[PDB]
Amino acid sequence: MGNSVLLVSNLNPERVTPQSLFILFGVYGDVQRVKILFNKKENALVQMADGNQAQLAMSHLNGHKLHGKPIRITLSKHQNVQLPREGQEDQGLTKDYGNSPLHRFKKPGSKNFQNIFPPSATLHLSNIPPSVSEEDLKVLFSSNGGVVKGFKFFQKDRKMALIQMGSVEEAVQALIDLHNHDLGENHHLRVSFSKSTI
Structure with missing residues (x-):
């Protein structure tokens, strides 16, 4: 044991x-x-x-x-x-x-206030199809994404890359705007909004 x-x-x-x-x-x-x-x-x-x-x-x-x-x-x-x-x-x-019942712990509920950070947006791109270069997506995140603070492409998430976009709402806009018009498979390039430090 x-x-x-x-x-x-x-x-x-x-x-x-x-x-x-x-x-x-x-x-x-x-x-x-x-x-x-x-x-x-x-x-x-x-x-x-x-x-x-x-x-x-x-x-x-x-x-x-x-x-x-x-x-x-x-x-x-x-x-x-x-x-x-x-x-x-x-x-x-x-x-x-x-799962625990509502009678497992006493008065539930916690408090907030614990270091406030700025609302930033970090998105990672998944494997890209053999036809669109990183410049095509990187440009979309800027003109179609909204606010691109910088993008780093590397092996990070395995052949994946991450991009910083101050305005978080803008980071998600890239998924809709960059790929606003697709065909179906949507290719293998994936765009997801992730919240890192700050």
Whole structure:
């Protein structure tokens, strides 16, 4: 009896919470508890293998062969000997398979005020089709996007790139404006608005 939880790498945007990702592993409804916080996006905690469930979950989920979304899955290591009773609500956010009723905690509700940042817009472009260069999209984000503070193309998200656009509403406008008129497949170039630091 030691550490044996499969961590799922993905939770990137905000609409992509563990509730949806948990459903993927929930296929067996065996994760005793799921924790989401220090994962810093792109990471999640699924507890069920305890060594055995990973045999079913680790093998059944791994080698899944991604064909639309590149997701990474890792297995907690920790070779030393750690005891339980030390990870069920002391890390920050801990959810238990299913959901907690409105009578689990006392008066719910939290407070705000915690460092205000400027509303900026960072979007990443997914693999581009063999025909349109980066200059074509980069120009769209400016004249069709709205406000382009700068764009950096590199291997970041794997052959992907990110662009900064102060006005966030403008960043989304590029998706509609840059690709306002498509044909169907929409090509392989993907435009998504992401919120980084600031």
